[PDB]
Design a binder for this molecule. Structure first.
Ligand SMILES: *[C@@H]1O[C@H](CO)[C@@H](O[C@@H]2O[C@H](CO)[C@@H](O)[C@H](O)[C@H]2NC(C)=O)[C@H](O)[C@H]1NC(C)=O
Ligand SMILES: *[C@@H]1O[C@H](CO)[C@@H](O)[C@H](O)[C@H]1NC(C)=O
Ligand SMILES: *[C@@H]1O[C@H](CO)[C@@H](O)[C@H](O)[C@H]1NC(C)=O
Lengths: 50, 49, 117, 49
């Protein structure tokens, strides 16, 4: 059955866009990640590096 | 803006790329934003298939 | 073979439109690597310029990759730890070492291969 | 059956791991009052109670 949508309808009946994102658990090589960090480089003093 | 109906909900598969979640939880255009299982911030420190 | 009669490969598990498959098929400009459900009927024909008959239908795509005396074009294929690895060299006695080219994170099983030719 | 009424209450407060044997009696509405809460002050202000 078709929705009836009009700009004068109630807020409860107003349209709403819902996006559900689902990520599967770890069972394969990981291909989606995010940015981690970046930092300027220094020299001639012993520091911790990654 | 063109979205499918609830009965004909479309599926978009995203993989093999870098995901930027910082825009998602820092945008005021979303009235409802809730994550089940994992905290939204820590999602920027994990990887999935 | 000092020509392009042999160009690419067909590769994967038992090809019956099930499980998965691998192309690793290249056309000079693009080394296109798709792992879609390519329905291979009976034809590993080279696409020459007329058309490309290697596949009948493509159901579910999952991966895509794009990149760039005689000569001995030599290759080595491995699949281990869920990674597909290819090594190659261009220039039978003598000793030479092989250098990595790509590292595909696919992880699918493979038990069969064919040459286009 | 006729018992708990706004007295036996838990805390969903986060971003501050408490040391062992500590009393977290901060009965305050949780808000950052800065950028990391909807980008303005007063929003995402939920009391973790
Ligand atoms: C080689 O095959 C590819 C894939 O069929 C052809 O398409 C190229 O690659 C992708 C499509 O998968 C797109 O970027 C373009 O359609 C093409 N890109 C470029 C840079 O050509 C491609 O045209 C084929 N090349 C030849 C010479 O036949
Ligand atoms: C393609 O993937 C969908 C995902 O649900 C599945 O239902 C379908 O059977 C798959 N088709 C083939 C040919 O594997
Ligand atoms: C490879 O085969 C095993 C069993 O033979 C199966 O459990 C596994 O899922 C297969 N690999 C993939 C990537 O599906």
């Amino acid at each position: 059955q078709s929705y009836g949508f009009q700009p004068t309808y109630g807020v409860g009946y107003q349209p709403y866009r819902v996006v559900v994102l689902s990520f599967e658990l770890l069972h394969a090589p990981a291909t989606v990640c995010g940015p981690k960090k970046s930092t300027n480089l220094v020299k001639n003093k012993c520091v911790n590096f990654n | 803006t063109r979205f499918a109906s609830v009965y004909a909900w479309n599926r978009k598969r995203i993989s093999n790329c870098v995901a930027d979640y910082s825009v998602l939880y820092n945008s005021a255009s979303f009235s409802t934003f809730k994550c089940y299982g994992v905290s939204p911030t820590k999602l920027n420190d994990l990887c999935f298939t | 073979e000092k020509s392009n009669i042999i160009r690419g490969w067909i590769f994967g598990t038992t090809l019956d439109s099930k499980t998965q498959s691998l192309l690793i098929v290249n056309n000079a400009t693009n080394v296109v690597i798709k792992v879609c459900e390519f329905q291979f009927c009976n034809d590993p024909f080279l696409g020459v310029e007329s058309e490309f008959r290697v596949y009948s239908s493509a159901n579910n795509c999952t991966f895509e990759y794009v990149s760039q005396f005689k000569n001995l074009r030599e290759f080595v294929f491995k699949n281990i730890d869920g990674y597909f690895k290819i090594y190659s060299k261009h220039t039978p006695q003598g000793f030479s070492a092989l250098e990595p080219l790509v590292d595909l994170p696919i992880g699918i099983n493979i038990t069969r291969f064919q040459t286009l030719l | 059956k006729v018992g708990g009424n706004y007295n036996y209450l838990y805390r969903l407060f986060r971003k501050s791991n408490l040391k062992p044997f500590e009393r977290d009696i901060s009965t305050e509405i949780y808000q950052a009052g800065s950028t990391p809460c909807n980008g303005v002050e007063g929003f995402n202000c939920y009391f973790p109670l």
